[PDB]
Amino acid sequence: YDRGVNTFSPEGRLFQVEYAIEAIKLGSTAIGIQTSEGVCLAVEKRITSPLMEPSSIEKIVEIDAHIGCAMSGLIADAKTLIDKARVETQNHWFTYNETMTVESVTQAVSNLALQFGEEDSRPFGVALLFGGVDEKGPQLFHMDPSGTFVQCDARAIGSASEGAQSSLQEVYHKSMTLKEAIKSSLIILKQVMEEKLNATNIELATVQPGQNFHMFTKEELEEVIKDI
């Protein structure tokens, strides 16, 4: 049935891609939200042992000053795609002498993911969310391991993805301020990650057209952590 991706199901489905779809769930909860004010991302930081370096779980990361990433799945295969997203901006710097849009970074990472079925390596068990404030404004995009990509006004991946998504559909619209989007995301996060929120099990970042700078909104976001 499912020894390799060289053949499909007798239904025509691959017995591999949906496996990546549930493998999305092996990681912690993760959220991304686009507003006219920018894009924000969040991931549960739930530690294995708190005496591990607490920032070493780099599931909320900056790609560049105007672009950030969040992941769901294993950190190992996520590292390759995140590094691709980061290095393409410097490639744009050294070739076109200007900045790169998040759409084309998305396209390049998609083509890198889309290699395991048309080479001549292996599927990546990670779902990625990018948020940019790029040359086309605020722009949140989502890739599943399948190598396709879609624009999203908001999105949820990782554990408890679909419940968070369905509950967020009640409290979202395309163009609010990113701050109240953060608040509405957090009031759902508080119940999605484990039971209670702190740096050991929560993490979030954001970027705005008024801030092409310091996506790492951590430990200064503390007030809205205690706003909820």
Partner 1 sequence: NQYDNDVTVWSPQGRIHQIEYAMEAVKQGSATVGLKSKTHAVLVALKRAQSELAAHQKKILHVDNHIGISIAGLTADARLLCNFMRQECLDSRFVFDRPLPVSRLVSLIGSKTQIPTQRYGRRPYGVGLLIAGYDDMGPHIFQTCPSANYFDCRAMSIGARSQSARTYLERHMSEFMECNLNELVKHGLRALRETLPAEQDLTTKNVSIGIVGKDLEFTIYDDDDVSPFLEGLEERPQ
Partner 2 sequence: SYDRAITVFSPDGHLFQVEYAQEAVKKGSTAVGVRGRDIVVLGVEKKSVAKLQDERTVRKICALDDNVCMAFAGLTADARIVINRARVECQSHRLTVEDPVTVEYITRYIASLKQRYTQSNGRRPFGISALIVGFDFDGTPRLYQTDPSGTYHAWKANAIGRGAKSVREFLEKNYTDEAIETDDLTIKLVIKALLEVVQSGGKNIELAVMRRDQSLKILNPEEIEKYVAEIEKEKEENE
Partner 3 sequence: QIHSRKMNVSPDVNYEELARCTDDFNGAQCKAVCVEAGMIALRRGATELTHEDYMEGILEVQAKKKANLQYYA
Q: Which residues bind partner 3 (CB under 8 A)?
A: 12-14, 16-18, 146, 148
* CA 10 – CA 65 distance, rounded (Å): 47
Helix axes 102-113, 75-95, angle to 10 degrees: 130
- Picked from partner 3, partner 1, partner 2, none, the partner binding residue 53 (CB below 5 to 8 A depending on kind) is partner 2
Using the rule CB under 8 A, is 91 a contact of partner 1? no
b (16+ CB within 10 A) / e for 161-198: beebbebbeeebeeeeebeebbebbbebbeebbeeebe
Is 69 strand, coil or helix? strand
CB 35 to partner 2: min, Å: 31
- Picked from partner 1, partner 3, partner 2, none, the partner binding residue 169 (CB below 5 to 8 A depending on kind) is partner 1
Distance, CA of 113 to chain centre: 15
For residue 164, CA distances in Å to 33, 145, 159, 216, 222 come to: 12, 20, 9, 23, 22
Q: Which two tokens stand for residue 228?
A: 């909820």
Pick from 103, 135, 153, 194: which binds partner 1 (CB under 8 A)? 153
* CA 138 – CA 134 distance, rounded (Å): 6
* CA 139 – CA 133 distance, rounded (Å): 6
* CA 209 – CA 7 distance, rounded (Å): 46
Using the rule CB under 8 A, is 16 a contact of partner 2? yes
The dihedral through the CA atoms of 216, 222, 225, 228 has a sign that is negative
Nearer to partner 3, 107 or 191 (CB): 107
Pick from 55, 169, 175, 177: which binds partner 1 (CB under 8 A)? 169
- Which residues from 119-158 bind partner 2, rule CB under 8 A? 121-123, 125
Site string for partner 2, 49-88 (x = CB under 8 A): xxxxx--xx----------------xxxx-xx--------
Using the rule CB under 8 A, is 7 a contact of partner 1? yes
Using the rule CB under 8 A, is 146 a contact of partner 1? yes
CB 198 to partner 3: min, Å: 37
Distance, CA of 33 to chain centre: 10
Q: Which residues bind partner 2 (CB under 8 A)?
A: 2-4, 15-16, 19-20, 22-26, 49-53, 56-57, 74-77, 79-80, 121-123, 125
Q: Which residues bind partner 1 (CB under 8 A)?
A: 5-14, 17, 114, 117-118, 120, 142, 146-148, 150-155, 165, 168-169, 172, 174
